[PDB]
Structures are given as structure tokens and as C-alpha cells.
Design a protein around this motif. Structure first.
Motif, PDB file in Angstrom:
ATOM      1  N   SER A   1       0.821  -1.209   0.000  1.00 34.56           N
ATOM      2  CA  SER A   1       0.000   0.000   0.000  1.00 34.56           C
ATOM      3  C   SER A   1       0.858   1.264   0.000  1.00 34.56           C
ATOM      4  O   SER A   1       1.969   1.264   0.544  1.00 34.56           O
ATOM      5  CB  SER A   1      -0.916  -0.025   1.235  1.00 34.56           C
ATOM      6  OG  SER A   1      -1.582   1.208   1.440  1.00 34.56           O
ATOM      7  N   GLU A   2       0.365   2.365  -0.553  1.00 35.39           N
ATOM      8  CA  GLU A   2       1.223   3.538  -0.563  1.00 35.39           C
ATOM      9  C   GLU A   2       1.532   3.856   0.891  1.00 35.39           C
ATOM     10  O   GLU A   2       2.688   4.073   1.254  1.00 35.39           O
ATOM     11  CB  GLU A   2       0.517   4.719  -1.229  1.00 35.39           C
TER      12      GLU A   2
ATOM     13  N   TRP B   1      -4.970  -4.185  -5.883  1.00 36.37           N
ATOM     14  CA  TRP B   1      -4.341  -4.775  -4.709  1.00 36.37           C
ATOM     15  C   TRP B   1      -4.390  -6.295  -4.752  1.00 36.37           C
ATOM     16  O   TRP B   1      -5.249  -6.879  -5.423  1.00 36.37           O
ATOM     17  CB  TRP B   1      -5.052  -4.282  -3.444  1.00 36.37           C
ATOM     18  CG  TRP B   1      -6.531  -4.569  -3.465  1.00 36.37           C
ATOM     19  CD1 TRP B   1      -7.515  -3.758  -3.952  1.00 36.37           C
ATOM     20  CD2 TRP B   1      -7.186  -5.761  -3.004  1.00 36.37           C
ATOM     21  NE1 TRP B   1      -8.738  -4.364  -3.818  1.00 36.37           N
ATOM     22  CE2 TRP B   1      -8.567  -5.593  -3.239  1.00 36.37           C
ATOM     23  CE3 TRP B   1      -6.741  -6.952  -2.411  1.00 36.37           C
ATOM     24  CZ2 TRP B   1      -9.508  -6.570  -2.902  1.00 36.37           C
ATOM     25  CZ3 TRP B   1      -7.677  -7.924  -2.079  1.00 36.37           C
ATOM     26  CH2 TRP B   1      -9.043  -7.726  -2.325  1.00 36.37           C
TER      27      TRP B   1
ATOM     28  N   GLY C   1      -5.401   1.435  -3.260  1.00 34.17           N
ATOM     29  CA  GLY C   1      -5.511   1.609  -4.697  1.00 34.17           C
ATOM     30  C   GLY C   1      -6.246   0.397  -5.246  1.00 34.17           C
ATOM     31  O   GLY C   1      -5.972  -0.728  -4.829  1.00 34.17           O
ATOM     32  N   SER C   2      -7.182   0.609  -6.167  1.00 35.13           N
ATOM     33  CA  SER C   2      -7.960  -0.488  -6.695  1.00 35.13           C
ATOM     34  C   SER C   2      -7.112  -1.268  -7.681  1.00 35.13           C
ATOM     35  O   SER C   2      -7.476  -1.469  -8.840  1.00 35.13           O
ATOM     36  CB  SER C   2      -9.225   0.030  -7.380  1.00 35.13           C
ATOM     37  OG  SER C   2     -10.040   0.749  -6.471  1.00 35.13           O
TER      38      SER C   2
END
Lengths: 109, 144, 144, 144, 109, 109
Positions: free
Chosen positions: C95-96, D101, D98-99
């Protein structure tokens, strides 16, 4: 009345046995002599349906924070939880509803 | 036969004694999916090892936050030394995300243990442990 | 008795040979919680299978980033074929989030292995592996 | 010898019958890393228990989203009662992130099962299950 | 002097044995004849307290990136790590302090 | 021709056996009498290299959504997948390319 297949513990003659009603469980299976012994579910246990369990199901649902007993642990059903008056359910989290909200749904301004 | 236990979560009675400390969890040991057999005893947050040998030990703790990180530690305690041994650690930094999250942490491995050893599960924050159902947070061990 | 090994992490000596490749990890095999017994030998990143049968194999690798994803693969190598077999994969998109994160990845399953097979653990990025303690990154196997 | 099965993922045939329900997964049972032995049979999404005893049961399901949460449940079905038992749950809230993952969810524990019991793995959303390779999504059990 | 219960390996007479001091471990347990043999902890091992381990504890703490030895592996204590001069500890990550910062704390502008 | 060490199943005389070519596998090992029997890889199986497997490798790669067969399952290679015409690969996800984009690379406006 529902029924279940069984083979005798003494001498294995395959006989059709009686199911136990909700609230009960097979304490002793049916014989060529006698029918099925259904005993009552012990404390904090339940059977909701006609069954042939040799052991009642445990009431295994505890109510969390933001939660209250929607339904108590009876001998015929498991415990169930709804949210408290201050909260409504969403995705698995019981959370607040912002008035300027039923346990099932978010009421709006 | 062989010492075996699968233990399930219960409501946690929040203790006051924790000086930067990871508290142990209380477990169910006989109801529902919980069982202990063949001299593997559960008392007072510990699982007592009855027989020296190689054990597979496992736990999952589901966390829900409604905190920088979340941590599970499985710990061996002996009388022969005042400090415990950390057998397994599962530590996960908690993303800013949304303050309505849930996460499991799973650990399982094999250890040589001795008759008399006590196994317990410690968490970073007891108030984050999901205790609502027996299939979500559990702890178990069996002699191989 | 039965072939068993629990191995623990050490400092990783960063190799230069990796052509889009997942490097194997080096393990401790005798100190602290690490052990090998009953002909289950650890040499040079591999665990040597001494006896054909069904094995439970497991590993956790804790990752810390101070990268799109993180991956652990447990790999079987035989002499009978030039390419390895991937037994287990645990892959997690990163994840960012915040560039100060940590995460475990745990794998464990049962496989039919043959005398002479070599088991190793590969990671996506060796510089992300937390090597600081033996309870966080480990690798083990035992004949059922 | 002892009932053992390791099962691997296949393409999932998306069923229409799911009234707020978690569908079971279809598994490979004989090709590649998949096997069943010693009367442990796989038929029609279930693993049939041939012999009463204590079993270690495990599964990983890798999820990829290209959804509030993701969930795996390992479920016991008996003929003696109309409702299943949830043995293990691994539930993880899905971060806004974010879509694009991916995440594994791993479960493994020990349960006393009875001859005739059926074990199956249920997921929250079948269209999120990564089915592309056998090392990423798997399901297994063995009598201890 | 601390003490521990033990049963003899030769003929099981339950006798109270002597604890081993920090730096040592029970190499041989006490008998009806002789007291407890305490041997010195081998390289990279320690015992910090009065104990009756049959094996010293391993120095199992390695210092990471952004980290230095706060304390070396002695026979009486484990190795310990603090952050380097450029960094301070936070949540488990040793990270930088921005001057216009002690290993324990962030100093400000 | 590659080769492999083996000990006989009948009477264990250590003999050097012949490797099987791509597309085949060791169905029967070489004896003091006869050479190595290489049988053809069965449906949905492969061997890409000179080998001495007693079982061919399974074609274990399924193409996902946003994906097509770059290479079919042959007896000499595994199946391989590229992205579909609408998508390009990135980090493990086959995703769209925005025209105002080859299966390997993102083409720009």
C-alpha cells in the motif's frame, strides 16, 4: 417426524432411528428394543432443528463493544447481537449515526 | 495418546498491571471447538506441557480498531529462568487507513519443549482483540 | 525418529547474482530456537530431505520498508530437473501507506517430497527482510 | 497409513445461488501439487473425512481486486445437523488503498472431526479469488 | 543464594540443589554426594539471573540498519541495540531527526 | 546426450543411465540389460529440458481476467499468459492503457 439410519452398538442390526426435536440431542441412540433417548440441551447450549447430534451446539457468539443481545442463548437458538441504541451496523462494525438511527439502518438529518 | 489442545477466545478481563507490557490472553478450554486432551492442561492463561518433545504451536488473533502497530507473541515460560522466551512474533504496522479496520495475525511453528513449560499468547493491546467468536481468535498446540 | 528442522533468520549477505530473480535466504540451524534433527540437514540455503514422505513445511518472513509488492516463495529443487518447483507463494501488494511499514507473510502446507530434495525460501527483495530477531522470520519442516 | 490431502485452486465456475451467502471453492485433487490419499476423498467442493480423529486443517486464499472486506471460512458440514460449523475465519477489512491490490489470507488449526464429516472452504467473493496458480490458493488436511 | 528442587539421576532421592549465578548454567545437577556444577556460558550466550538452565540463552538480537550496539553480548546479558547518531527510535523504526536528536528522543528546531 | 547415476531395482549394480529428452520422462530406468525407457508426456503435462523425472510437470498456469494465452501447454513447455489487447502488465496486474499499448508496455498519447 424426521428419521435417521443407525447400526446397533450391541449387535449391529441396521435400524431407522428417531430424530431429536429442537432443544434436545441424542443421549442414547435407538435400539431394536427401545426408541431414541433425547436429552435436554445443557446450560449455554442449543439445537435449533430436528437433529441427531450426540452433543448440543455451544452458544458461541459474544456481544462486543457497541453491541447488545438481540436474542439470548436459549436451548432452541444461539445468542444473537444487534448494535446498541447509539449505533448502526455496517460491514461488521457497529458505528454511530449523526443526528443534527436503528440498529439495522442509518437514519438521516 | 499425544498431548493436544485447541483453545478459543473469551471476553478479556482487562488487567491493570502492564508496565509497557504485553498482556496474556484468557482462553476457553472445553466449550465449542475448544478442547484439551492427554494431560495437556489449560490453567490461568497458560498451556502446561506434560511431556518433553517437539510441538507444533499456533495462534491467530484477530484485531479490530474502531495505535501504531499490532503484535502477537507466543511465549514460553519456565521455572528455571525468570525471563520468558519469545518463540514466535507476528507484528504488523497499522496503516492510517480508516479508523474502522480489522486484521488477523497468524503464527505457527515447531519447537522443542520440556515437561513443565508454560505456553501463553501475548498481545500488544488487549482492547483491540476481537473476542466475539471462537473461529476468529484461537490458540493451539500438539506433540508431533 | 522423524526428520525435523526449525530454522531462524540471520543477517543476509547481499548477493550480486539476481537477473530479475528472487534470492534465497540464509538461515541459522543450531543456535537459539533453531534446530535440525534426524538427518534433516541444513547446508547453503537449502534444507536437505533425507527420507521420502509427506512433510509439513512452513515459513514466516517479516518485511520492513523504511516497492510495489512483497513476496515469499518456498521452493523445491531436485537434481532430476533443472527448474525448481514453487510449492507455496505468499504475495502482498504494498500500500502507498507511509514509508515506515512492517508486515509478516506466513505460509504453511503439506507436500509429498523425495529423498534428496532441497527446500529453500525465496524473497522478492532481500533488503526488506527483517533479520533482527529469530521469532520474526523463520523456516521449518517436519515429516508427518 | 493416515488420511491426507493437499488441494490446489482451479478456475471457479460462478454459481447463481448465493442469498447473502459465502460460496464454497472448487479444488484440484490430483494434478500438480494436489493429492489425496488413504481414503481422504475430494468430491464436489468437500473433503470427506474417512476416520474419526484429530486433524490439522489449513487453507490460503489469495485475493486480488482489480469491496469492504475479504473473508475465508473453513466449514464443517455433518448430516446430523442442517447448519454447518465455522471452524476457522480469516477476515480482513480492505483498505481504500488503490484499486489494484492483492492479499493472502492464511488459516490453519487442529480439530476433532468425525467419520463422515465434510470440510469445505468458503469465500466472501468468488470473483476476488486468485486462481491463476496452485501455490497461491490451496486447502489441506491431515490426521495427526 | 537461591535454590531448586531436583530428583537424582542415579537413585531418585529428592534433594534441594544450588542455583547457578549469572554467567553460568547447570552443567551437572547436585547429587547426594556433591553440589551443583555450574559451568561458564559459552561464546555468544548469556544468563542474566540466578538460574537452573541446562543450557545458556543465545544472544539472539541483531542490530539492523539505522542501528548500533547499545550493549554487547556478555555472559551476563543479551546484546542490545540503540539507533545510530543520525536517528531516533519510534514505534520500532529508527528514523531521522530534522535539524534546521538523541537515540531515545526527537530534539526540535 | 546428458546422463544420470542410478542403482538397479533388481540387483543394485550402480550404472550410469540415459537422460530423457524434452517431451518425455523416465517411464522405466535403465538396467544392466536395456537402456532408459522414455515415455511421452501425458495430456496437460510437459518437460522442457533433458530430465530424469519419473513424472512429467503439470501445466499449472491458468490465464486470469485481462489475460490471454501467450503460449499453449505443449509437451515441451508450460502454458504462458500475456495481457489482452486492451491491457498491459504492471507489477502482476494486467491493466488498461489510456489512448487520447502492447501487452508488455504502456504506449503514450
Amino acid at each position: 417426524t424426521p428419521t435417521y439410519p443407525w447400526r446397533d452398538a450391541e449387535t449391529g442390526e441396521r435400524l431407522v432411528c428417531a430424530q431429536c426435536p429442537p432443544g434436545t440431542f441424542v443421549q442414547r441412540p435407538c435400539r431394536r428394543d427401545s426408541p431414541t433417548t433425547c436429552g435436554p440441551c445443557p446450560p449455554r447450549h442449543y439445537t435449533q432443528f430436528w437433529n441427531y447430534l450426540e452433543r448440543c451446539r455451544y452458544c458461541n457468539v459474544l456481544c462486543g463493544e457497541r453491541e447488545e443481545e438481540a436474542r439470548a442463548c436459549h436451548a432452541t437458538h444461539n445468542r444473537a447481537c444487534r448494535c446498541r441504541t447509539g449505533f448502526f451496523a455496517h460491514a461488521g462494525f457497529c458505528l454511530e449515526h449523526a443526528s443534527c438511527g436503528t440498529p439495522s439502518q442509518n437514519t438521516q438529518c | 495418546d499425544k498431548p493436544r489442545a485447541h483453545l478459543t477466545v473469551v471476553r478479556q478481563t482487562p488487567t491493570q498491571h502492564f508496565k509497557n507490557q504485553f498482556p496474556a490472553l484468557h482462553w476457553e478450554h472445553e466449550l465449542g471447538l475448544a478442547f484439551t486432551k492427554n494431560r495437556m492442561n489449560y490453567t490461568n492463561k497458560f498451556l502446561l506441557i506434560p511431556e518433553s518433545g517437539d510441538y507444533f504451536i499456533y495462534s491467530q488473533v484477530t484485531f479490530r480498531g474502531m495505535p501504531d502497530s499490532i503484535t502477537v507473541v507466543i511465549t514460553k515460560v519456565t521455572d528455571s529462568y525468570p525471563e520468558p522466551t519469545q518463540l514466535l512474533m507476528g507484528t504488523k504496522s497499522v496503516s492510517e487507513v480508516g479508523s474502522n479496520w480489522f486484521q488477523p495475525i497468524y503464527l505457527g511453528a515447531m519447537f522443542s519443549l520440556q515437561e513443565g513449560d508454560k505456553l501463553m499468547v501475548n498481545v500488544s493491546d488487549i482492547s483491540l482483540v476481537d473476542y466475539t467468536k471462537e473461529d476468529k481468535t484461537f490458540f493451539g498446540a500438539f506433540l508431533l
